[PDB]
């Protein structure tokens, strides 16, 4: 009984809750796909120029 | 002086069983401290757990 309570103690300190990591995973997929999106938006800035000459 | 030999087996396993739990190195039952306080909030307010010796 006292191996399985220190076991149960060990996991409580170090065991992850997954629902939230599944959770932060579905946040942070579509932040790096907007980011992309973004970054792809601030690559174009530049083509105005052609049009002044 | 059977009778006896038990009750002396049966405190022996008290002993082992008090003294034996321990977590962290640190112990709430075995009667080593007087209390153990853990934090609470966030400008280190503490929770007080007073220790039962057992």
């Known amino acids: ?53 | 002086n059977a009778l006896k030999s038990d009750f002396d087996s049966l405190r022996d396993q008290i002993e082992k069983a008090a003294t034996n739990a321990k977590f962290n190195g640190v112990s709430i039952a075995d009667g080593s401290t007087t209390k153990l306080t853990f934090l609470a909030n966030s400008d280190g307010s503490g929770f007080t757990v007073n220790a039962k010796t057992i």
């Open chain 1, 1 to 53: 009984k006292l191996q399985d309570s220190l076991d149960a103690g060990v996991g409580n300190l170090v065991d992850a809750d997954l629902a939230k990591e599944s959770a932060k995973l579905q946040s942070l997929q579509t932040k790096q796909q907007l980011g992309v999106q973004a970054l792809s938006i601030a690559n174009q800035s530049s083509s105005s120029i052609l049009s002044l000459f």
